[PDB]
Design a protein around this motif. Structure first.
Motif, PDB file in Angstrom:
ATOM      1  N   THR A 270     -10.479   8.300  -3.037  1.00  0.00           N
ATOM      2  CA  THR A 270     -11.322   8.147  -2.028  1.00  0.00           C
ATOM      3  C   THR A 270     -11.055   9.044  -0.537  1.00  0.00           C
ATOM      4  OG1 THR A 270     -11.556   6.051  -3.126  1.00  0.00           O
ATOM      5  CG2 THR A 270     -11.862   6.082  -0.316  1.00  0.00           C
ATOM      6  N   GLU A 271     -12.099   9.542   0.202  1.00  0.00           N
ATOM      7  CA  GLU A 271     -11.715   9.751   0.820  1.00  0.00           C
ATOM      8  C   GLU A 271     -10.846  11.392   0.976  1.00  0.00           C
ATOM      9  OE1 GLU A 271     -12.820   6.482   4.138  1.00  0.00           O
ATOM     10  OE2 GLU A 271     -11.683   7.718   5.552  1.00  0.00           O
ATOM     11  N   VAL A 272     -11.343  12.017   0.011  1.00  0.00           N
ATOM     12  CA  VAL A 272     -10.300  12.932  -0.822  1.00  0.00           C
ATOM     13  C   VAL A 272      -8.726  12.659  -0.708  1.00  0.00           C
ATOM     14  CG1 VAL A 272      -9.673  15.046  -0.442  1.00  0.00           C
ATOM     15  CG2 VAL A 272     -12.162  14.243   0.687  1.00  0.00           C
ATOM     16  N   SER A 273      -8.270  12.363   0.475  1.00  0.00           N
ATOM     17  CA  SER A 273      -6.854  12.482   0.832  1.00  0.00           C
ATOM     18  C   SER A 273      -6.471  10.813   0.670  1.00  0.00           C
ATOM     19  CB  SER A 273      -6.541  13.226   1.589  1.00  0.00           C
ATOM     20  OG  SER A 273      -6.913  13.422   2.906  1.00  0.00           O
ATOM     21  N   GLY A 274      -7.104  10.363   0.955  1.00  0.00           N
ATOM     22  CA  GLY A 274      -7.045   8.390   1.439  1.00  0.00           C
ATOM     23  C   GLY A 274      -5.874   8.111   0.572  1.00  0.00           C
ATOM     24  N   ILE A 275      -5.375   6.807   0.798  1.00  0.00           N
ATOM     25  CA  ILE A 275      -4.375   6.014  -0.346  1.00  0.00           C
ATOM     26  C   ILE A 275      -4.832   4.660  -0.700  1.00  0.00           C
ATOM     27  CG2 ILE A 275      -2.257   4.346  -0.369  1.00  0.00           C
ATOM     28  CD1 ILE A 275      -1.476   6.735   0.996  1.00  0.00           C
ATOM     29  N   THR A 276      -5.258   3.821  -1.959  1.00  0.00           N
ATOM     30  CA  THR A 276      -5.845   2.890  -2.080  1.00  0.00           C
ATOM     31  C   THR A 276      -4.924   2.053  -2.088  1.00  0.00           C
ATOM     32  OG1 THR A 276      -7.763   4.629  -2.318  1.00  0.00           O
ATOM     33  CG2 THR A 276      -7.623   1.898  -3.713  1.00  0.00           C
ATOM     34  N   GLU A 277      -5.388   0.898  -1.873  1.00  0.00           N
ATOM     35  CA  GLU A 277      -4.949  -0.354  -2.272  1.00  0.00           C
ATOM     36  C   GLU A 277      -5.657  -1.553  -3.493  1.00  0.00           C
ATOM     37  OE1 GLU A 277      -2.164  -4.089   0.453  1.00  0.00           O
ATOM     38  OE2 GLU A 277      -4.473  -4.212  -0.121  1.00  0.00           O
ATOM     39  N   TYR A 278      -4.228  -1.505  -4.264  1.00  0.00           N
ATOM     40  CA  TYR A 278      -4.794  -2.454  -5.571  1.00  0.00           C
ATOM     41  C   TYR A 278      -3.857  -4.159  -4.794  1.00  0.00           C
ATOM     42  CZ  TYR A 278      -7.909   1.667  -7.864  1.00  0.00           C
ATOM     43  OH  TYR A 278      -8.547   2.518  -7.794  1.00  0.00           O
ATOM     44  N   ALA A 279      -4.719  -5.162  -5.128  1.00  0.00           N
ATOM     45  CA  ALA A 279      -4.148  -6.045  -5.204  1.00  0.00           C
ATOM     46  C   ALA A 279      -4.784  -7.626  -6.689  1.00  0.00           C
ATOM     47  CB  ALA A 279      -4.501  -6.820  -4.157  1.00  0.00           C
ATOM     48  N   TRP A 280      -3.222  -7.407  -7.338  1.00  0.00           N
ATOM     49  CA  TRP A 280      -3.486  -8.945  -7.984  1.00  0.00           C
ATOM     50  C   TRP A 280      -3.877  -9.934  -7.271  1.00  0.00           C
ATOM     51  CZ3 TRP A 280      -2.955  -9.181 -13.377  1.00  0.00           C
ATOM     52  CH2 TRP A 280      -3.457 -10.383 -14.133  1.00  0.00           C
ATOM     53  N   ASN A 281      -5.107 -10.399  -7.491  1.00  0.00           N
ATOM     54  CA  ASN A 281      -5.148 -11.938  -7.424  1.00  0.00           C
ATOM     55  C   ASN A 281      -5.848 -13.046  -8.829  1.00  0.00           C
ATOM     56  OD1 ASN A 281      -7.613 -14.101  -6.231  1.00  0.00           O
ATOM     57  ND2 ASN A 281      -6.394 -13.561  -4.615  1.00  0.00           N
ATOM     58  N   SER A 282      -4.824 -13.099  -9.880  1.00  0.00           N
ATOM     59  CA  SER A 282      -5.101 -13.546 -10.826  1.00  0.00           C
ATOM     60  C   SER A 282      -5.664 -12.196 -11.619  1.00  0.00           C
ATOM     61  CB  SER A 282      -6.146 -14.954 -11.351  1.00  0.00           C
ATOM     62  OG  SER A 282      -5.467 -16.077 -10.921  1.00  0.00           O
ATOM     63  N   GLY A 283      -5.487 -11.213 -11.443  1.00  0.00           N
ATOM     64  CA  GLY A 283      -6.534 -10.073 -12.033  1.00  0.00           C
ATOM     65  C   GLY A 283      -6.432  -9.275 -10.990  1.00  0.00           C
ATOM     66  N   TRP A 284      -6.630  -8.108 -11.107  1.00  0.00           N
ATOM     67  CA  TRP A 284      -6.841  -6.991 -10.333  1.00  0.00           C
ATOM     68  C   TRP A 284      -8.241  -6.553  -9.967  1.00  0.00           C
ATOM     69  CZ3 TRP A 284      -1.846  -4.440  -8.712  1.00  0.00           C
ATOM     70  CH2 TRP A 284      -1.394  -4.395  -9.232  1.00  0.00           C
ATOM     71  N   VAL A 285      -8.144  -6.163  -8.108  1.00  0.00           N
ATOM     72  CA  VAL A 285      -8.988  -6.005  -7.199  1.00  0.00           C
ATOM     73  C   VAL A 285      -8.908  -4.904  -6.195  1.00  0.00           C
ATOM     74  CG1 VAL A 285     -10.081  -8.466  -7.974  1.00  0.00           C
ATOM     75  CG2 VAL A 285      -8.713  -8.184  -5.825  1.00  0.00           C
ATOM     76  N   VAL A 286      -9.940  -4.381  -5.776  1.00  0.00           N
ATOM     77  CA  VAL A 286      -9.886  -3.282  -4.895  1.00  0.00           C
ATOM     78  C   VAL A 286      -8.943  -4.187  -3.637  1.00  0.00           C
ATOM     79  CG1 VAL A 286     -10.318  -1.431  -3.228  1.00  0.00           C
ATOM     80  CG2 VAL A 286     -11.280  -1.749  -5.463  1.00  0.00           C
ATOM     81  N   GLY A 287      -8.077  -4.533  -3.036  1.00  0.00           N
ATOM     82  CA  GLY A 287      -7.172  -4.939  -1.964  1.00  0.00           C
ATOM     83  C   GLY A 287      -8.171  -4.701  -0.415  1.00  0.00           C
ATOM     84  N   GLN A 288      -7.938  -2.803  -0.571  1.00  0.00           N
ATOM     85  CA  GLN A 288      -8.102  -2.252   0.742  1.00  0.00           C
ATOM     86  C   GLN A 288      -8.669  -0.567   0.116  1.00  0.00           C
ATOM     87  OE1 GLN A 288      -8.433  -2.972   3.995  1.00  0.00           O
ATOM     88  NE2 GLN A 288      -9.691  -0.436   3.972  1.00  0.00           N
ATOM     89  N   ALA A 289      -9.735  -0.252   0.329  1.00  0.00           N
ATOM     90  CA  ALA A 289     -10.545   1.026  -0.453  1.00  0.00           C
ATOM     91  C   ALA A 289     -10.131   2.355   0.036  1.00  0.00           C
ATOM     92  CB  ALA A 289     -12.086   1.469  -0.607  1.00  0.00           C
ATOM     93  N   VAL A 290      -9.029   2.163   1.289  1.00  0.00           N
ATOM     94  CA  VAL A 290      -8.599   3.312   1.464  1.00  0.00           C
ATOM     95  C   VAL A 290      -8.374   2.542   3.040  1.00  0.00           C
ATOM     96  CG1 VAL A 290     -10.681   4.162   2.798  1.00  0.00           C
ATOM     97  CG2 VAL A 290      -8.218   5.365   2.903  1.00  0.00           C
ATOM     98  N   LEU A 291      -5.987   3.494   3.623  1.00  0.00           N
ATOM     99  CA  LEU A 291      -5.250   2.966   4.055  1.00  0.00           C
ATOM    100  C   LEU A 291      -5.412   3.436   5.275  1.00  0.00           C
ATOM    101  CD1 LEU A 291      -4.134   1.270   2.084  1.00  0.00           C
ATOM    102  CD2 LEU A 291      -2.088   2.042   2.613  1.00  0.00           C
ATOM    103  N   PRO A 292      -5.117   3.096   6.746  1.00  0.00           N
ATOM    104  CA  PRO A 292      -5.163   4.292   7.557  1.00  0.00           C
ATOM    105  C   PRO A 292      -4.043   5.332   7.416  1.00  0.00           C
ATOM    106  CG  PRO A 292      -4.741   1.519   7.998  1.00  0.00           C
ATOM    107  CD  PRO A 292      -4.512   2.090   6.440  1.00  0.00           C
ATOM    108  N   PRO A 293      -4.636   6.426   8.174  1.00  0.00           N
ATOM    109  CA  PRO A 293      -5.033   6.919   9.558  1.00  0.00           C
ATOM    110  C   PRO A 293      -7.294   6.205   9.106  1.00  0.00           C
ATOM    111  CG  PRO A 293      -4.742   9.319   8.780  1.00  0.00           C
ATOM    112  CD  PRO A 293      -4.193   8.658   7.533  1.00  0.00           C
ATOM    113  N   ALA A 294      -7.511   6.391   7.923  1.00  0.00           N
ATOM    114  CA  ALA A 294      -8.878   6.137   7.518  1.00  0.00           C
ATOM    115  C   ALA A 294      -9.145   4.792   7.766  1.00  0.00           C
ATOM    116  CB  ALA A 294      -8.863   6.450   5.788  1.00  0.00           C
TER     117      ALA A 294
END
Ligand SMILES: CO[C@@H]1O[C@@H](C)[C@@H](O)[C@@H](O)[C@@H]1O
Ligand SMILES: CO[C@@H]1O[C@@H](C)[C@@H](O)[C@@H](O)[C@@H]1O
Ligand SMILES: CO[C@@H]1O[C@@H](C)[C@@H](O)[C@@H](O)[C@@H]1O
Ligand SMILES: CO[C@@H]1O[C@@H](C)[C@@H](O)[C@@H](O)[C@@H]1O
Ligand SMILES: CO[C@@H]1O[C@@H](C)[C@@H](O)[C@@H](O)[C@@H]1O
Ligand SMILES: CO[C@@H]1O[C@@H](C)[C@@H](O)[C@@H](O)[C@@H]1O
Ligand SMILES: CO[C@@H]1O[C@@H](C)[C@@H](O)[C@@H](O)[C@@H]1O
Ligand SMILES: CO[C@@H]1O[C@@H](C)[C@@H](O)[C@@H](O)[C@@H]1O
Ligand SMILES: CO[C@@H]1O[C@@H](C)[C@@H](O)[C@@H](O)[C@@H]1O
Lengths: 294, 294
Positions: A270-294
């Motif tokens: 995601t955004e080439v070099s960007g970090i992605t957050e996955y979140a457990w909420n009774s199942g895996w979901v995208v917590g945040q697609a790309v972390l700062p500084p994006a």
């Protein structure tokens, strides 16, 4: 957006204090950037560098709430170093240790007092523990776990006090992911073994609860197919294959913070070099697609 | 021991004069090292460094026999630089050009005279041609292929004397591997397209023969799941998937030298960080399990 300043792959570490998060990501110049979650994501910018290591530095971070944070990285001089937070600004810590140029780092706070373990790989490729119990005695050698794959990831987690419980995951010289354990009576070889994995396959751990029924441990690991998968332990155990499975860029590191805010950080492109957050909420979901500084 | 000094993953470049080979491999301190094949393999040691770039430097290498060798790398200052060989000892080339921090390098000789093309990625993420025609004129800006994926691999191959033939392979902003062609009458988008590949997937090109039926092009490239595969063009035409399919470490580079001495160099995890040679001999075999300094 200066997301393209983030390494590919980056060293990643994460901590949390309630629903307050910090993620430490490696900039491609060796800079260790802080991203802050305080009800929304900020930081990761050049003015959020807490220290500078060599290009490709591993990052390890550990905390006691946000009262004390300690972040570990490797300099161009092949020495592991320490950035410190004690509530009123970042400063250079007393931790300085020679490591193999390819060493990873793990670090844990022990209980709620200021007691620290750091795990690094020596020139001889053994995993050595560093011990800080108090200022009077300072940094000493703890246990040496013997021969490990050169360049192995090192993933450490702790729970409990009186005694403390520590698990350290790393690769043996036959590419197996093994576990070094401590429950107050010496270091042992643990139940966890992932056979014949990819050389220097990334590793990330988190844990929650206490010994007995409440206990959880999660170990995130690279497959040879550029997935990150999950080994899980609950209460009295049986390691099992958990539900977490995600495609990553070749070589993605991974970092986890524990339940009840179970989040997993990796690079999936995601955004080439960007970090992605996955979140457990009774199942895996995208917590945040790309972390700062994006 | 000495092989553990090689980056994980390492920039790789290969050239050949008949059955004499040279492989350039990045040490984990940015050292550009020469392994020699003169009936047996040697080199790769610290006293075989020809230049020092940043950790994770790309390496490009091109030659006219062994009379003239040019080796390109990126320094810690984000400047692509050159190490030269004119048959009498290694010296510092006049080529010093600003590059994006994550820039790759492709480099070709044009014919048997001293004419050189170098392809890099600028700060604006465009692919840039550098032209050397003679000493009188020196290094000049040439063609610019426009926006590429930030941190794209860049592979370059040339054949023919007059007109000269050039193909440059790199990743567009949509992650597709694409081709820029020159056949003597201006640049064009070529027929080679590998849709939606891994961001910054490694790339390695060799060519042999001449325009006509004898032409060979081989493009090696990284797949989402840590295989190196092959696109093949024989003489008249029709890109086809080649026989070459090998497993690699995450982010392995690839370098190749042309038929009739066709060899592919990549990192598959042998001795952890050692480069493995594959050989074409009516079928793909292992030519050298691990290159020096192992
Ligand atoms: C203001 O204090 C904030 O929280 C601390 C725990 C640190 O993460 C610091 O970098 C940040 O600015
Ligand atoms: C007071 O000392 C500071 O914190 C300790 C807990 C250690 O991390 C030490 O290296 C650092 O300088
Ligand atoms: C008692 O078993 C030990 O502790 C568990 C929490 C697991 O880490 C297991 O692999 C280890 O051997
Ligand atoms: C209930 O499922 C188990 O625990 C969750 C917290 C997740 O880690 C999941 O991947 C795992 O299989
Ligand atoms: C509700 O917000 C969720 O939990 C927070 C503590 C962060 O992990 C955030 O990115 C995630 O979307
Ligand atoms: C004569 O100049 C030398 O050879 C040319 C072909 C170029 O590679 C130049 O950078 C180098 O310094
Ligand atoms: C005639 O076709 C041109 O030359 C061939 C050798 C290939 O590179 C093809 O992709 C290109 O467009
Ligand atoms: C016919 O075989 C083709 O040419 C050879 C020289 C090899 O590149 C092989 O992988 C390819 O399929
Ligand atoms: C004759 O031996 C084969 O060709 C040489 C030119 C080298 O590629 C060598 O490693 C390979 O095994």
């Amino acid at each position: 957006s200066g997301v393209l300043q983030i390494s590919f792959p980056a060293g990643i570490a994460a901590i949390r204090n309630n629903s307050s998060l910090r993620v430490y990501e490696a900039a491609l110049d060796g800079g260790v950037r802080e991203a802050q979650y305080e009800g929304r994501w900020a930081g990761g910018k050049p003015d959020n560098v807490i220290a500078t290591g060599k290009i490709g530095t591993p990052i390890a971070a550990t905390s006691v709430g946000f009262q004390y944070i300690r972040v570990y990285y490797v300099g161009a001089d092949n020495k592991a170093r320490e950035a410190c937070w004690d509530g009123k600004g970042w400063y250079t810590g007393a931790f300085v240790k020679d490591v193999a140029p390819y060493s990873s780092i793990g670090a844990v706070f022990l209980g709620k007092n200021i007691v620290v373990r750091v795990y690094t790989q020596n020139h001889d490729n053994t995993i050595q523990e560093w011990v800080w119990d108090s200022p009077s005695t300072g940094w000493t050698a703890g246990a040496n776990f013997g021969a490990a794959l050169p360049g192995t990831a090192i993933a450490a987690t702790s729970w409990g006090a009186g005694p403390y419980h520590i698990r350290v995951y790393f690769q043996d010289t036959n590419r197996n992911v093994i576990e070094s354990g401590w429950d107050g009576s010496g270091w042992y070889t643990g139940g966890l073994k992932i056979s014949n994995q990819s050389p220097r396959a990334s590793l990330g751990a988190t844990s929650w609860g206490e010994s007995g029924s409440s206990l959880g441990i999660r170990l995130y690991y690279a497959t040879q197919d550029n997935l990150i998968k999950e080994k899980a332990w609950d209460g009295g155990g049986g390691w099992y294959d958990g539900g977490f499975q995600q495609r990553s860029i070749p070589g993605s590191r991974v970092a986890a913070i524990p339940l009840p805010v179970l989040r997993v950080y990796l690079q999936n492109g995601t955004e080439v070099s960007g970090i992605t957050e996955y979140a457990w909420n009774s199942g895996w979901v995208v917590g945040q697609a790309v972390l700062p500084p994006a």
